[PDB]
Amino acid sequence: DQRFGDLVFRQLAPNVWQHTSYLDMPGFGAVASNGLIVRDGGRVLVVDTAWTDDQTAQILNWIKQEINLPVALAVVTHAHQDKMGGMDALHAAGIATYANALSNQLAPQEGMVAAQHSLTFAANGWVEPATAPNFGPLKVFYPGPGHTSDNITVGIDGTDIAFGGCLIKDSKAKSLGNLGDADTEHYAASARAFGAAFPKASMIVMSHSAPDSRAAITHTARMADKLR
Ligand SMILES: [Bi+3]
């Protein structure tokens, strides 16, 4: 783990790093949130912001220092502060931003700034490719409503990594965490749909746990069975 200011960076594969930021949240302790940084040839792609603009600007500083290539775009995986809290920092840096159309719709009422571009999805869950131009190895998938109605997930082609965001919890998690905006009826199915979308992925990266095996998917889905 590389400590960089108050953030933590962890290399997961030759061209993939996890970014981690913390929010000292009254009543819940200091909460970690994870996203990804992916180098694709001569550019960098970001999955999710940090909790704040200042933290997100530090992600961009780390990228400048450690990779020193332009950030082509960012994709954010739902309209909550842990994933979209730093949108203004991205926009100030001239980075093109993408989110689920529904996330952009929800952003203002969630207290977030919307991304510049809206992803739409086919019936089977795969992103409509015209809406995700120049995504390179990022394979975007809407698994159905779960942690939130708008949650999306991302696989990284050329690696064994898939990012479940806030939908997936680790294999030893006691609970599904914050269910305030969750769809309790569809959660288990959506977690299983994520696993089926990225069947070869052996490292599952998540918003609020360290990377785990596919046991995170099975455990998450089993816990979600009890919400029905
Ligand atoms: Bi969240």
Short mmCIF file of C-alpha atoms and ligand atoms in Angstrom, two decimals:
data_model
loop_
_atom_site.label_atom_id
_atom_site.label_comp_id
_atom_site.label_asym_id
_atom_site.label_seq_id
_atom_site.Cartn_x
_atom_site.Cartn_y
_atom_site.Cartn_z
CA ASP A 1 0.00 0.00 0.00
CA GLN A 2 1.39 3.35 -1.08
CA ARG A 3 0.28 6.15 1.26
CA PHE A 4 -0.07 9.46 -0.62
CA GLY A 5 -1.40 12.31 1.48
CA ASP A 6 -4.50 10.87 3.17
CA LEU A 7 -5.10 8.49 0.27
CA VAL A 8 -3.85 4.97 -0.34
CA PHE A 9 -2.86 3.43 -3.70
CA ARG A 10 -2.38 -0.30 -4.32
CA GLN A 11 -1.12 -1.82 -7.55
CA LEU A 12 -3.34 -4.74 -8.60
CA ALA A 13 -1.90 -5.56 -12.01
CA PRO A 14 0.84 -4.06 -14.21
CA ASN A 15 -1.50 -1.31 -15.49
CA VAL A 16 -4.18 -1.27 -12.74
CA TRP A 17 -4.17 0.45 -9.34
CA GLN A 18 -6.83 0.74 -6.65
CA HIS A 19 -7.38 4.23 -5.16
CA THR A 20 -8.67 4.52 -1.60
CA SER A 21 -10.03 7.55 0.23
CA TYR A 22 -11.60 8.06 3.68
CA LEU A 23 -14.51 10.08 5.02
CA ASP A 24 -14.77 10.72 8.72
CA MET A 25 -18.54 10.26 8.79
CA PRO A 26 -20.43 11.21 12.03
CA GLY A 27 -21.89 8.02 13.61
CA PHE A 28 -20.23 5.53 11.21
CA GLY A 29 -16.49 5.99 11.73
CA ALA A 30 -13.94 6.63 8.98
CA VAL A 31 -15.27 4.91 5.86
CA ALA A 32 -12.99 3.70 3.06
CA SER A 33 -14.08 3.97 -0.55
CA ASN A 34 -12.16 2.30 -3.40
CA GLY A 35 -11.97 2.94 -7.14
CA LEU A 36 -9.62 2.09 -9.99
CA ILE A 37 -6.94 3.67 -12.17
CA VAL A 38 -6.15 1.88 -15.47
CA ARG A 39 -3.42 2.68 -17.95
CA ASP A 40 -4.46 1.90 -21.52
CA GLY A 41 -1.52 2.56 -23.82
CA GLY A 42 -0.74 6.28 -23.67
CA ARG A 43 -3.69 7.30 -21.49
CA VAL A 44 -5.20 6.75 -18.09
CA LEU A 45 -8.84 5.80 -17.30
CA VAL A 46 -10.41 6.35 -13.87
CA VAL A 47 -13.24 4.42 -12.21
CA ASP A 48 -14.97 6.45 -9.51
CA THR A 49 -14.00 9.64 -7.73
CA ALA A 50 -12.86 9.96 -4.13
CA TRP A 51 -15.29 11.22 -1.48
CA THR A 52 -14.32 14.87 -2.09
CA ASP A 53 -12.99 17.25 -4.70
CA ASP A 54 -9.77 17.79 -2.79
CA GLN A 55 -9.21 14.02 -2.52
CA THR A 56 -9.98 13.59 -6.19
CA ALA A 57 -7.43 16.27 -7.09
CA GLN A 58 -4.90 14.22 -5.07
CA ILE A 59 -5.74 11.12 -7.17
CA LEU A 60 -4.89 13.21 -10.24
CA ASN A 61 -1.64 14.32 -8.57
CA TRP A 62 -0.65 10.75 -7.82
CA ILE A 63 -1.38 9.83 -11.45
CA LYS A 64 0.82 12.74 -12.68
CA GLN A 65 3.63 11.61 -10.35
CA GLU A 66 3.47 7.82 -10.79
CA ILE A 67 2.19 7.33 -14.35
CA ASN A 68 2.61 10.76 -16.02
CA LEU A 69 0.09 10.25 -18.82
CA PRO A 70 -3.16 12.17 -19.55
CA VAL A 71 -6.42 11.03 -18.02
CA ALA A 72 -8.73 10.46 -20.97
CA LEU A 73 -11.93 9.81 -19.09
CA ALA A 74 -13.60 8.70 -15.91
CA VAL A 75 -16.61 6.49 -15.32
CA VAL A 76 -18.49 6.75 -12.03
CA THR A 77 -20.60 3.83 -10.83
CA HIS A 78 -23.55 5.45 -9.01
CA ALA A 79 -24.81 8.77 -7.64
CA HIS A 80 -23.48 8.70 -4.06
CA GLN A 81 -20.68 10.76 -2.50
CA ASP A 82 -18.20 7.89 -2.36
CA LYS A 83 -18.31 7.51 -6.19
CA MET A 84 -19.21 11.02 -7.45
CA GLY A 85 -18.16 13.37 -4.64
CA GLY A 86 -15.18 14.60 -6.66
CA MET A 87 -16.82 15.33 -10.04
CA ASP A 88 -15.90 19.02 -10.00
CA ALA A 89 -12.18 18.09 -9.63
CA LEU A 90 -12.40 15.92 -12.72
CA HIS A 91 -14.19 18.65 -14.67
CA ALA A 92 -11.67 21.29 -13.53
CA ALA A 93 -8.92 19.03 -14.95
CA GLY A 94 -10.71 18.80 -18.34
CA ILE A 95 -11.49 15.08 -17.96
CA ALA A 96 -14.45 13.62 -19.88
CA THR A 97 -16.91 12.00 -17.44
CA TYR A 98 -19.45 9.20 -17.84
CA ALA A 99 -22.17 7.72 -15.66
CA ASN A 100 -25.33 5.68 -16.03
CA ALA A 101 -28.07 7.93 -17.39
CA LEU A 102 -30.01 7.22 -14.20
CA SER A 103 -27.02 8.28 -12.06
CA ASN A 104 -26.92 11.64 -13.91
CA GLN A 105 -30.63 12.07 -13.34
CA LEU A 106 -30.28 11.28 -9.62
CA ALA A 107 -27.11 13.32 -9.05
CA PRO A 108 -28.61 16.74 -8.24
CA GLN A 109 -31.01 15.38 -5.60
CA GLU A 110 -28.23 13.25 -4.13
CA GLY A 111 -26.11 16.42 -3.81
CA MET A 112 -23.77 15.41 -6.61
CA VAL A 113 -22.62 17.08 -9.81
CA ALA A 114 -23.69 14.99 -12.86
CA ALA A 115 -21.19 13.49 -15.27
CA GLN A 116 -20.94 15.12 -18.72
CA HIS A 117 -22.08 12.01 -20.60
CA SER A 118 -24.76 9.38 -20.03
CA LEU A 119 -24.31 5.66 -20.50
CA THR A 120 -27.32 3.63 -21.60
CA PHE A 121 -27.66 -0.14 -21.40
CA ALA A 122 -29.14 -2.94 -23.52
CA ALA A 123 -31.77 -5.31 -22.09
CA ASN A 124 -29.08 -7.88 -21.20
CA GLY A 125 -27.17 -5.31 -19.12
CA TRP A 126 -24.22 -4.54 -21.43
CA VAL A 127 -23.49 -0.87 -22.07
CA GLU A 128 -24.64 0.37 -25.48
CA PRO A 129 -21.18 0.85 -27.01
CA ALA A 130 -21.99 4.15 -28.76
CA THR A 131 -22.47 5.74 -25.31
CA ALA A 132 -19.04 4.56 -24.07
CA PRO A 133 -16.63 5.69 -26.79
CA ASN A 134 -12.89 5.15 -26.28
CA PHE A 135 -13.41 3.01 -23.15
CA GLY A 136 -10.57 0.71 -24.23
CA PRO A 137 -10.41 -2.30 -21.94
CA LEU A 138 -13.25 -1.10 -19.64
CA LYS A 139 -16.29 -3.33 -20.07
CA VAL A 140 -19.33 -1.74 -18.43
CA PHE A 141 -22.29 -3.75 -17.19
CA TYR A 142 -25.57 -2.83 -15.47
CA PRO A 143 -26.40 -5.90 -13.34
CA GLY A 144 -29.79 -4.65 -12.16
CA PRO A 145 -30.80 -2.70 -9.07
CA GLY A 146 -29.03 -3.68 -5.81
CA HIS A 147 -27.01 -1.41 -3.53
CA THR A 148 -28.77 1.36 -5.48
CA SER A 149 -31.12 1.40 -8.50
CA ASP A 150 -28.38 2.92 -10.70
CA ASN A 151 -25.34 0.80 -9.70
CA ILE A 152 -23.03 -0.23 -12.54
CA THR A 153 -20.00 -2.48 -12.67
CA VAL A 154 -16.80 -2.63 -14.70
CA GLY A 155 -14.51 -5.39 -15.98
CA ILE A 156 -10.97 -4.76 -17.18
CA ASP A 157 -10.17 -6.62 -20.40
CA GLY A 158 -6.67 -8.15 -20.38
CA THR A 159 -6.78 -8.73 -16.59
CA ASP A 160 -8.54 -11.05 -14.16
CA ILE A 161 -10.14 -8.02 -12.43
CA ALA A 162 -13.79 -7.00 -12.20
CA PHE A 163 -15.10 -4.08 -10.14
CA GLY A 164 -18.34 -4.61 -8.30
CA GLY A 165 -18.47 -1.15 -6.72
CA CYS A 166 -20.92 -0.92 -3.84
CA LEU A 167 -22.95 -3.90 -5.01
CA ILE A 168 -20.40 -6.47 -3.79
CA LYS A 169 -19.07 -7.00 -0.23
CA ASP A 170 -16.13 -9.23 0.73
CA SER A 171 -16.42 -12.96 1.59
CA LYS A 172 -16.21 -12.33 5.34
CA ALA A 173 -18.59 -9.32 5.50
CA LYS A 174 -21.11 -9.36 8.36
CA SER A 175 -23.73 -7.39 6.42
CA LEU A 176 -24.57 -5.67 3.14
CA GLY A 177 -23.79 -2.30 4.81
CA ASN A 178 -25.89 0.73 3.86
CA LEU A 179 -29.23 -0.43 2.40
CA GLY A 180 -30.97 3.01 2.55
CA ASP A 181 -31.26 3.28 -1.26
CA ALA A 182 -31.16 -0.46 -1.95
CA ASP A 183 -33.54 -2.66 -3.92
CA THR A 184 -33.96 -5.55 -1.50
CA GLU A 185 -36.10 -7.61 -3.95
CA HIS A 186 -33.57 -7.67 -6.80
CA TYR A 187 -30.21 -7.48 -4.92
CA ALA A 188 -29.33 -11.19 -4.92
CA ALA A 189 -30.12 -11.57 -8.62
CA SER A 190 -28.09 -8.44 -9.48
CA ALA A 191 -25.05 -9.72 -7.54
CA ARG A 192 -25.28 -13.05 -9.40
CA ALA A 193 -25.72 -11.20 -12.74
CA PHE A 194 -22.47 -9.34 -12.04
CA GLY A 195 -20.69 -12.67 -11.52
CA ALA A 196 -22.11 -14.12 -14.74
CA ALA A 197 -21.11 -11.02 -16.75
CA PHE A 198 -17.42 -11.45 -15.76
CA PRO A 199 -17.11 -15.23 -15.30
CA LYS A 200 -13.31 -15.38 -15.69
CA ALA A 201 -12.60 -12.60 -13.15
CA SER A 202 -10.63 -13.97 -10.17
CA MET A 203 -9.96 -10.68 -8.36
CA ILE A 204 -13.12 -8.86 -7.36
CA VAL A 205 -12.57 -5.20 -6.43
CA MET A 206 -15.24 -3.49 -4.29
CA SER A 207 -16.06 -0.06 -2.88
CA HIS A 208 -15.81 -0.81 0.85
CA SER A 209 -13.62 -3.91 1.19
CA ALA A 210 -10.16 -4.91 0.01
CA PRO A 211 -9.98 -7.03 -3.16
CA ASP A 212 -11.22 -10.60 -2.75
CA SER A 213 -11.86 -13.79 -4.65
CA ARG A 214 -15.18 -14.66 -6.27
CA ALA A 215 -16.30 -15.75 -2.79
CA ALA A 216 -17.25 -12.12 -2.36
CA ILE A 217 -19.91 -12.56 -5.07
CA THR A 218 -21.28 -15.80 -3.64
CA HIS A 219 -21.31 -14.45 -0.05
CA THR A 220 -22.91 -11.19 -1.11
CA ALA A 221 -25.64 -13.00 -3.05
CA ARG A 222 -26.28 -15.43 -0.16
CA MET A 223 -26.68 -12.55 2.32
CA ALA A 224 -28.97 -10.83 -0.16
CA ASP A 225 -31.17 -13.97 -0.41
CA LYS A 226 -32.32 -13.14 3.19
CA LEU A 227 -33.63 -9.71 2.09
CA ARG A 228 -36.34 -11.60 0.14
BI BI B 1 -22.16 3.75 -2.32
#
